[PDB]
Design a binder for this molecule. Sequence first.
Ligand SMILES: NC(=O)C1=CN([C@@H]2O[C@H](COP(=O)(O)OP(=O)(O)OC[C@H]3O[C@@H](n4cnc5c(N)ncnc54)[C@H](OP(=O)(O)O)[C@@H]3O)[C@@H](O)[C@H]2O)C=CC1
Ligand SMILES: [Cl-]
Ligand SMILES: [Cl-]
Length: 315
Amino acid sequence: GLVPRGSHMEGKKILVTGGTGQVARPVAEALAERNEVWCLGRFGTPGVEKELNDRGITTFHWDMDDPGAAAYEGLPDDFTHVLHSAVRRGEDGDVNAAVEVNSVACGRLMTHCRGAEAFLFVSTGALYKRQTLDHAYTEDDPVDGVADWLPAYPVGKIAAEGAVRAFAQVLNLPTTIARLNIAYGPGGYGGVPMLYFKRMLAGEPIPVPKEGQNWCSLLHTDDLVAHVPRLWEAAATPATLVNWGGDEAVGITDCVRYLEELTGVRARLVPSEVTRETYRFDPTRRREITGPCRVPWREGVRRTLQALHPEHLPS
Ligand SMILES: NC(=O)C1=CN([C@@H]2O[C@H](COP(=O)(O)OP(=O)(O)OC[C@H]3O[C@@H](n4cnc5c(N)ncnc54)[C@H](OP(=O)(O)O)[C@@H]3O)[C@@H](O)[C@H]2O)C=CC1
Ligand SMILES: [Cl-]
Ligand SMILES: [Cl-]
């Protein structure tokens, strides 16, 4: 029951992109104990590269905005496992840059790592065509590129998924495409739940629907980290597609109310026609691959608050 995080996988050589980010940093940190881990990125945030190096992570400058093959000189080709979590996604409305940069980076990275045992590409649930608020989306539900908040983002992921599927087959590189739901946890900035809390602190409106509430499938960092080795094991040619979320249906308003409950901070719920969109996933396929999640969301969110905003909790 008490098992160290680093024991999920040992003796491998792991390439991680997006290793500074919300999703992949805890993964790289967890695997760095018993594996050789390289993080590819830009490391523009002061001190993050030092923090990763201090854990025994080898860091390697890698910018997806560089279109050429020269960017890969000096990078080993004997990685056994790859986690591609970085996303080139800088608001400018430039859908062509988003499609081009992300798609080409997938191709160049998979080709470089064509000898790997498994390649894991992180995608998003935002590319599902909106059905009902409470619908539990499956891997076969219709897809569109609609996102009012960030239009180029889901379109770029559709294009990147296309590249990933094609290179998986051409290279015979076992691959998993994991469309991630909302990740959260005590590291980084805490995920969407803490973004809501920040708005509550600032007195900013939180749109909610006229009837009911929005729904998601929150995934805690500790569960996310446990899942990565199982997602690599499920990698295949053709690529394995899975909706990657938690085991609990989490109402967004329920989450906001819980933050109020914990802190005494009041949310300004605005019943509204137009709300920021979230998606709940049917966990059936993911559970077949990973087994059940372990962290219930109310305890996870409470401890995330304690880690990132301890002063706003009753003392
Ligand atoms: N809740 C969530 O977090 C969700 C995440 N996802 C997906 O999960 C993945 C990781 O997301 P998340 O951790 O939240 O992202 P973050 O915004 O936390 O981090 C983005 C990451 O992308 C890297 N990156 C961005 N631009 C470049 C570039 N030009 N060259 C190299 N690296 C770059 C950054 O590296 P550096 O700092 O070195 O620049 C950083 O590590 C993405 O594919 C995203 O679409 C999907 C749904 C929800
Ligand atoms: Cl640094
Ligand atoms: Cl974008």
